[PDB]
A = this chain, B = another copy of it.
Amino acid sequence: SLIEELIRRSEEQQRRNEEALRQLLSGIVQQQNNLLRAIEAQQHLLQLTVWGIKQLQARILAVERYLKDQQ
């Protein structure tokens, strides 16, 4: 959602820099900061998913071991 907010902000600066191409340098540098911030937020969300996956792994493993032990 913040990712969606940084992406919508990036789409804005892209229209600006495009319409300015049709001054320009500052907006390109600003747009690179917008892209970096999106990438950084996506990395935060990706790190969460990695840990969520490991936790699911541990949970499935516990069930698998339980079923094995029940034999």
Report which A residues bind B (CB closer than 8 A): 3-4, 7, 10-11, 14, 17-18, 21, 24-26, 28-29, 31-33, 35-36, 38-40, 42-43, 45-46, 49-50, 52-53, 56-57, 59-60, 63-64, 66-67
10 closest A-B pairs by beta carbon, nearest first, are A52-B53, A59-B60, A38-B39, A10-B36, A17-B29, A56-B56, A31-B32, A21-B29, A35-B35, A49-B49
Which residue on chain B has the smallest CB distance to residue A38?
Answer: B39
Asked if B59 and A53 sit within 8 Å, CB to CB, the answer is: no
Number of copies: 3
Q: Write out the residue numbers on chain B whose beta carbons fall within 8 Å of the beta carbon of A14.
A: 29, 32-33, 36
